[PDB]
Here is the input.
Amino acid sequence: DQGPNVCALQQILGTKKKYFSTCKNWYKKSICGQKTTVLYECCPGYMRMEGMKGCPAVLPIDHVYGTLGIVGATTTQRYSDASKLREEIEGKGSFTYFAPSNEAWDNLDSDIRRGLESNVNVELLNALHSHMINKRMLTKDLKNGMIIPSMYNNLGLFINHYPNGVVTVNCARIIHGNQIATNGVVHVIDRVLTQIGTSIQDFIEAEDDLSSFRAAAITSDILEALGRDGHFTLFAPTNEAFEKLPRGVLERIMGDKVASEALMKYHILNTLQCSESIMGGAVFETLEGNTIEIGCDGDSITVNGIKMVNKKDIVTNNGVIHLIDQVLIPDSAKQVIELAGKQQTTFTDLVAQLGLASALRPDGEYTLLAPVNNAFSDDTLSMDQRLLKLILQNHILKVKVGLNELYNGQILETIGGKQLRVFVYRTAVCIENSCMEKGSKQGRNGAIHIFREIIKPAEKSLHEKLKQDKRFSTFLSLLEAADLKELLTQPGDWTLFVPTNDAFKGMTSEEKEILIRDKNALQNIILYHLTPGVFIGKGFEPGVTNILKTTQGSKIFLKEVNDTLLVNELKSKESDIMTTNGVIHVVDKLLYPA
Amino acid sequence: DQGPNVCALQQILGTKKKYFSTCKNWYKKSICGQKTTVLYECCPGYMRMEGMKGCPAVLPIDHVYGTLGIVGATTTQRYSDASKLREEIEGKGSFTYFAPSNEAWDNLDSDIRRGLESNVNVELLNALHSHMINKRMLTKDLKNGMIIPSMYNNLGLFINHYPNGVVTVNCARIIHGNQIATNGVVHVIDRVLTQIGTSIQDFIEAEDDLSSFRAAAITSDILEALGRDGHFTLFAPTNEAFEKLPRGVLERIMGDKVASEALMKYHILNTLQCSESIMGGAVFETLEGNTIEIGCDGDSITVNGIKMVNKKDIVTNNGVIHLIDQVLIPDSAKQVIELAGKQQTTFTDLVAQLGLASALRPDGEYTLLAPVNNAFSDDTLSMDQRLLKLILQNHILKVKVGLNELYNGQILETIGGKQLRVFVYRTAVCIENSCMEKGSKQGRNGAIHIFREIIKPAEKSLHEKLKQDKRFSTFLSLLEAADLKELLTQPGDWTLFVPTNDAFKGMTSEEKEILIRDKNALQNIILYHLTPGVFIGKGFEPGVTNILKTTQGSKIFLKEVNDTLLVNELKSKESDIMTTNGVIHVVDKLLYPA
Ligand SMILES: [Ca+2]
Ligand SMILES: [Ca+2]
Ligand SMILES: [Ca+2]
Ligand SMILES: [Ca+2]
Ligand SMILES: [Ca+2]
Ligand SMILES: [Ca+2]
Ligand SMILES: [Ca+2]
Ligand SMILES: [Ca+2]
Ligand SMILES: [Ca+2]
Ligand SMILES: [Ca+2]
Ligand SMILES: [Ca+2]
Ligand SMILES: [Ca+2]
Ligand SMILES: [Cl-]
Ligand SMILES: [Cl-]
Ligand SMILES: [Cl-]
Ligand SMILES: [Cl-]
Ligand SMILES: [Cl-]
Ligand SMILES: [Cl-]
Ligand SMILES: [Cl-]
Ligand SMILES: [Cl-]
Ligand SMILES: [Cl-]
Ligand SMILES: [Cl-]
Ligand SMILES: [Cl-]
Ligand SMILES: [Cl-]
Ligand SMILES: [Cl-]
Ligand SMILES: [Cl-]
Ligand SMILES: [Cl-]
Ligand SMILES: [Cl-]
Ligand SMILES: [Cl-]
Ligand SMILES: [Cl-]
Ligand SMILES: [Cl-]
Ligand SMILES: [Cl-]
Ligand SMILES: [Cl-]
Ligand SMILES: [Cl-]
Ligand SMILES: [Cl-]
Ligand SMILES: [Cl-]
Ligand SMILES: [Cl-]
Ligand SMILES: [Cl-]
Ligand SMILES: [Cl-]
Ligand SMILES: [Cl-]
Ligand SMILES: [Cl-]
Ligand SMILES: [Cl-]
Ligand SMILES: [Cl-]
Ligand SMILES: [Cl-]
Ligand SMILES: [Mg+2]
Ligand SMILES: [Mg+2]
Ligand SMILES: [Mg+2]
Ligand SMILES: [Mg+2]
Ligand SMILES: [Mg+2]
Ligand SMILES: [Mg+2]
Ligand SMILES: [Mg+2]
Ligand SMILES: [Mg+2]
Ligand SMILES: [Mg+2]
Ligand SMILES: [Mg+2]
Ligand SMILES: [Mg+2]
Ligand SMILES: [Mg+2]
Ligand SMILES: [Mg+2]
Ligand SMILES: [Mg+2]
Ligand SMILES: [Mg+2]
Ligand SMILES: [Mg+2]
Ligand code: NA
Ligand code: NA
Ligand SMILES: [Zn+2]
Ligand SMILES: [Zn+2]
Here is the structure.
């Protein structure tokens, strides 16, 4: 357990992946979402002493051949003996031996293994030499991207060195590294090295199970790049993956050069990521531009959280290939309705169930204003689905409008012939009565934006809202006394604080006669309640006091706290009453500039 | 100072570099080795209130043109007005404005500025449009490596986004980012954008001050790659840099294709590193393979700790160029004696002062075994320099022997005709009597290794060392009684513990007669003091007990603690007495297996 020169051999629970480390720093944490079991023993070569803690004694080093046995690579040792490599790695020189573990030899195909045992003089010797370098190279010398000639026919050894400490040779991970030998060093790797493929393109053209992906590739003029030099990571979708897609989707993406090209580039990484370098979740930029999330669940590689990898670490002269169960479809290749996620299903179901999905033609460009599922109450879903169909028609535009194109005062046109006002604030974008959330996406033929509430375009003007309610009567009269009816009737952008008749019943009529004598003070007192521009409370950043200049001249202060709108530190009763030419906030008492 | 919505404008002491941040996380630390001065004020748009801390009030947003004034870019505002760009950035649409600061316009060349003021209708408008994007892009949207078309002739804007948070456009750093406008966003940049060069190669061919580097480039066949697409960082050495080198060095490197090619690739980075992204020291891999250290002292860019950059941020369609005062010479292009550093100067002076430097021919391959300066005592430097010349001749090999080629039992041949034994241990490599330190380097025509002590090849065998000292007399007799003289005379590798005559004077002769009757126990008792192989105490790892198998059979335990060799927990008097065929450790009393 505790002591000097103690080594821990961990194994991820539920897998065969083993990680061998010294006890210098704590290495204990979940790997690939799973805990590990640990085996403590003296690091190879070190020994225990009586009455002492740990392993304070050490044995002398041996030659490379004996070090094969010191590290437990007894099968590699036997094969080294049978091929007469033993006498070379016992003599003069300095050698690096990437020795496959015993389990690595057990995992090798039986026909290949028997083929090696039947030709020990040449083929077996050439394979073991393929596992070797004619110089001593520690793991700190095996830099990422190095191509080091081996000891057989100068065959290239492709080194990868990752920030997490994983060192791979032809994607074979080094389990036990840096066992010093009198004439070299031994590193125990997790698989037997094999002949690398010619290139990724050549593997695609050769493999029949990648026929579909090949065709698409040749259609997208991207297969040529996968044959040139480089260090790519390709997530190749098999023919099963293409069969999984809905009908016509593959035909639709293939019929369009842009969607097909983006679809192809979305599977390719510009760097080499061996499977054994994945110890957790990370994001990687694809050639399409957008990223994919690569992770691991036990010994299963996950792509975008899906355990879709079935065959991994297909190494080739220009990078690695991992076969996957599904096709990776980037947003830039999806139809607009396909851009929605979980919290929009209701919306996307409704527009499908009420006959609007067919109106989103592939040759058109559209914008979906999708409310979250929480925005559809039972009372809303209980209305007649024709009215609900009109409402949904207020959430679809026949023009693609990206989030980066919206501006204050912009007017959007729904497919239902209605107009939507865009209000841009410092920290929020609100369309009519609904404000945007995060999660906007752009696709092949449109964009989608997520909203907290259902968008309901206003139907009454300020004047109609004022005269339809009785509690505003007196105030309305004053507004008409100031010749503001034409303002409250014509289109525009205003913010009006409407004091109820209760505020004037705090004046009790007499002060309305005292104010009636003033044909000028009513202009100030009344005009202070009006402000140019539409300022809704749910568009503010919470807690911050907004200083606005009313049309009267003096300042007014609006603060949104706990979903309540305060005006001059006075809690308003009703707020965000939308009209066609402004917004109304109902206040309890009168407002003065002070 | 403290409060919400407070912004800090820092300036690196001694420079003009300003960094504008909000007070969300502590941003206060030295940048480029210098402290900063800080200016606290409400973030633009926010206001203070009576009796409140910080800036809890806010003003409404404005259009892009007014936001130019809100952020202090009043000169950009004036130029926008004079070119009639103002009415466009006040109207419909969504714009990103990379507004140069007032200081940025002051730094612009006066002739170019006056040329813009004399053609406001087209040229000035086209430049300001070159500073703009026709969509709203926050800094989080300006991903690294993006080439975003501007609003003039679709001119490319080269985005770089660094892990430290620095965002640059054509290497112009964004000082104040993300000022939201009703119709866009304003980012204040630190310089006026100019037309990017055609390519790095074209700038090299055009610039006369890079004539030398051009020639070398054309000689190394690397100038073609600097004209193809990419994102390179080139540290171009001027003709002054080449003039600085010693005589013939440039001719020597140019006459060799390998040294010239490595010399050229050592100046080139595979990624784009704008100067304003450098806030501290970091290492970068060059195209040659080895790394360079890039840092900053105030506003001076440092390369390998030298303030050699004089003109920086020469942006071109395929990367950035920084002109430097010196030539970057990688180890792979240096003669072997040029590989030594500070702690080897004495050595490199000696071999030069005693006439050995000329023997290191460029067409030969050599290995220097350089002791540190601390290894040359005054008594050593006081010997006749001819003996010292022989000693130095024991530190030079006429064959290149890399550190990764040394193996246990190897015999090296000095230029003085002497032989050096290589002893490889688990954690140390010792040559004869001296053990290696870190810092081995490889060059054009040799390698260098650093040693703690002067290498003195042994001259006497075990037998000669035994008979030349009287305190060993008795023991020597016993060794000759066991027929070991031929072993102590012939070459080999042994470790002998020699008990002095004081140990046998603890037996007082009589026990030598009691042992004299035993013609077999003397074989065990004597042979226990001998061990196959050479084990010197300074080759051990400190504190660890080395378990060795003596030639008698039983185990012996050697531990090096506080530069003292303990054998079976017995402090030895003298240790590491080197002989031609072994090593001697003088013990106080006899040794028994026990
Ligand atoms: Ca052995
Ligand atoms: Ca390492
Ligand atoms: Ca192991
Ligand atoms: Ca094409
Ligand atoms: Ca989702
Ligand atoms: Ca507004
Ligand atoms: Ca203005
Ligand atoms: Ca950012
Ligand atoms: Ca500023
Ligand atoms: Ca060439
Ligand atoms: Ca140095
Ligand atoms: Ca030895
Ligand atoms: Cl470790
Ligand atoms: Cl954990
Ligand atoms: Cl053990
Ligand atoms: Cl055997
Ligand atoms: Cl690891
Ligand atoms: Cl390792
Ligand atoms: Cl070694
Ligand atoms: Cl990871
Ligand atoms: Cl994770
Ligand atoms: Cl239907
Ligand atoms: Cl219906
Ligand atoms: Cl876009
Ligand atoms: Cl309207
Ligand atoms: Cl916003
Ligand atoms: Cl109503
Ligand atoms: Cl005021
Ligand atoms: Cl910030
Ligand atoms: Cl500091
Ligand atoms: Cl202030
Ligand atoms: Cl003006
Ligand atoms: Cl920063
Ligand atoms: Cl910033
Ligand atoms: Cl905006
Ligand atoms: Cl940095
Ligand atoms: Cl630093
Ligand atoms: Cl001389
Ligand atoms: Cl001399
Ligand atoms: Cl090398
Ligand atoms: Cl010898
Ligand atoms: Cl070593
Ligand atoms: Cl002597
Ligand atoms: Cl024993
Ligand atoms: Mg094995
Ligand atoms: Mg690899
Ligand atoms: Mg396929
Ligand atoms: Mg792997
Ligand atoms: Mg929904
Ligand atoms: Mg938003
Ligand atoms: Mg009223
Ligand atoms: Mg509100
Ligand atoms: Mg300015
Ligand atoms: Mg840039
Ligand atoms: Mg030059
Ligand atoms: Mg810069
Ligand atoms: Mg020296
Ligand atoms: Mg060493
Ligand atoms: Mg004696
Ligand atoms: Mg010692
Ligand atoms: Na606001
Ligand atoms: Na040792
Ligand atoms: Zn205002
Ligand atoms: Zn031994």
Observations:
- The first strand of chain B starts at residue 6 and ends at 12.
- Residues B 355 surround chloride ion (ligand 38) (CB under 6 Å).
